[PDB]
């Protein structure tokens, strides 16, 4: 009677190959999400789950599961997961702390691009067959003299700073607690508080988890204090921000432009969670959205489910995994 | 009686009014592209003219308007005009020299990203309505561990490499001459064979003049050595590549993308230029495009127009353009 493993979503065959040995396997080797009451159905006497973004544990799930001992996100933002409810019940929380990093750097300095150039109507001309030439027509907003801000400043902020060194950018942020001086004189980064990052940059690129104090905290009181024209950029997740504030600021035309890979509609913790995004906001000109795919690199999504697998064979063990979230 | 000046497109109002103390304005305040019979019209009996990317000045050109003395150009590739003619015949040409450099790589970053990631389909699809949260598709390349291979390291090939600095890439190049070693070491560029970097790059950014030397220099031959799924990105000038050579590896799935801001349909010069972009190439996935906007950055245009601007009140007034092109008497 090996362990049960229950994994949400389906999973490489050397992942299978890894875990079997060491578990009775419980998989999802389809493209769809299954029902939360369906998860919940086999998660019922199983010993470990590996979860994923679509996935949302309360502490009414680890109740009518009191065998699970580990549940291995492969992901960064746990914010579905009730980390004190695990605490509680002695379950270790484990989750993949670098490799969704650079992705999403990546993605949100292309998003930043994209929306300051226009990249969406501009391929929509070229492929109408209509293009004739160069027009004195979509004129953007480049980096290069710009002031990039960044809201938060651990892996992702540090990550997109990385990658804009090069740009002539005057790079600023707000977070928490200061960067240490050394990281910040090599980044060239300079600590201002919430209001001025948002009144005084031309890009606003968010880099914080979704928590408490984090909900909403991109409000129609901050972006009432933007420069007119700036230009938002969300790869962190939709409820940082509020998306019908967005939309008003950029009906208003205060906001130049707003740039997503996420979305409110993802937040499953939120019992008020929105259904849909607005259908209005996707179809304003001055946006540009991908859907949740961050991490979506061929070569990494292997690497994710490799670290997720490796953390719950270490918990099942009854080894501290490496990545844990909690501490029992 | 004040010289008469051609201006081929829309310009900042900021430039007109520099100019018109100076200069009889004949304008196009527009965004059409007027007829090169109603430009020469227009031309005839101008003393100069303001040209910008859609414009073509070959001897003929020349000839129909002996007045002028000066063709400021608001680009810096001007291989559609025949400088060698504006020599002969005692007229400045003049180019916009750097100005139009970081814009263009900035774009060139972007169009490698959106080509790897799968940025036009993605946007589509969340626009659709039918987004329901975290998903199987648009799996794509990263920078990240990859090779960058740049064809060219002049002014925009430097400026992509300068950008590329933190993004954990190996970056290789070929150029006709080598860069120094403390540049190439400073910025982790390796100098390899035009042949290795086709065989061995991931991401492929061109960064190349369009010449008699580098027309189809990207053709079936060198897209025949790329890695199965490496991205080319080009964003100097259409003719640089055969772009039947593109479709076709791109049809086969050895190319894994293209994306280009230029078109060999662009390059008048040619006589035997294809009149558009093939309907297949524009209906291929692997694909994204922009319309020659490398440099549309809106501050960046006004600065631009201000150079030609500049060079052509300089000429007009018996000087030598600073950003003269060629050299006269
Ligand atoms: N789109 C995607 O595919 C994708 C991929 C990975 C991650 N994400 C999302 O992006 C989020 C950030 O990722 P990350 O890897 O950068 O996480 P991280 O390394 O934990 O960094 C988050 C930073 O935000 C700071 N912060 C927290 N609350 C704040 C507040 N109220 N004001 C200012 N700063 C605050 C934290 O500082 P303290 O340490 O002081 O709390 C921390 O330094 C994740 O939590 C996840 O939700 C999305
Ligand atoms: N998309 C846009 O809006 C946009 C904007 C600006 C420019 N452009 C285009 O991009 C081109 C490059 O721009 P740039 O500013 O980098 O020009 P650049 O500073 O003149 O650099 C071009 C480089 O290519 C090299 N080269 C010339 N012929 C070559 C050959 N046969 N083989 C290998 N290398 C060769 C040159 O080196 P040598 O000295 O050895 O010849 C030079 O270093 C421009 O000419 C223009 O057509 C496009």
Redesign the interface.
């Known amino acids: 009677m090996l362990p049960k493993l229950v994994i949400t979503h389906?999973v490489h065959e050397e992942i299978l190959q890894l875990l079997a040995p060491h578990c009775e396997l419980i998989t999802n080797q389809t493209?769809s999400?299954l029902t939360r009451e369906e998860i919940l159905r086999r998660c019922r006497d199983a010993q470990a789950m590996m979860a994923?973004?679509?996935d949302r544990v309360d502490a009414d799930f680890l109740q009518a599961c009191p065998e699970l001992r580990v549940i291995g996100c492969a992901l960064k933002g746990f914010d579905n997961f009730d980390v004190d409810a695990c605490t509680a019940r002695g379950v270790w929380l484990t989750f993949v702390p670098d490799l969704l990093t650079?992705?999403t750097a990546?993605?949100a300095?292309?998003?930043a691009?994209?929306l300051g150039?226009?990249?969406?109507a501009?391929?929509a001309?070229?492929?109408s067959?209509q293009?004739?030439?160069?027009?004195?027509?979509?004129?953007?907003?480049?980096?290069?003299?710009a002031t990039v801000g960044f809201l938060g400043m651990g892996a992702i902020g540090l990550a997109m700073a990385?990658?804009?060194?090069?740009?002539?950018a005057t790079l600023q942020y707000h977070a928490r607690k200061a960067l240490d001086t050394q990281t910040e004189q090599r980044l060239g980064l300079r600590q201002v508080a919430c209001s001025e990052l948002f009144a005084s940059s031309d890009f606003i690129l968010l880099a914080l988890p979704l928590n408490a104090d984090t909900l909403h905290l991109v409000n129609a009181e901050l972006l009432a204090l933007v420069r007119p024209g700036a230009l938002l950029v969300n790869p962190c997740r939709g409820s940082v921000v509020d998306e019908a504030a967005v939309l008003a600021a950029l009906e208003r035309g205060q906001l130049g432009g707003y740039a997503a890979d996420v979305?409110e509609?993802?937040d499953w913790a939120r019992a008020d969670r929105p259904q849909?995004?607005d259908?209005a906001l996707?179809?304003h000109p001055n946006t540009?959205?991908?859907?949740?795919?961050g991490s979506?690199?061929?070569?990494?999504?292997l690497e994710i489910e490799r670290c997720a697998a490796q953390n719950i064979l270490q918990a099942l063990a009854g080894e501290r995994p490496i990545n844990a979230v909690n501490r029992l």
Do not use: C, K, S
């Open positions: 389906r493209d999400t994923f973004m679509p650079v992705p990546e993605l300095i292309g998003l691009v994209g150039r226009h990249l969406r501009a391929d001309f070229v492929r067959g293009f004739r030439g160069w027009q004195p027509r979509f004129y953007g907003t480049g980096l290069d003299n990385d990658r804009l060194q090069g740009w002539g979305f509609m993802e849909q995004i259908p996707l179809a540009l959205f991908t859907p949740h795919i979506a690199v061929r070569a990494v999504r």
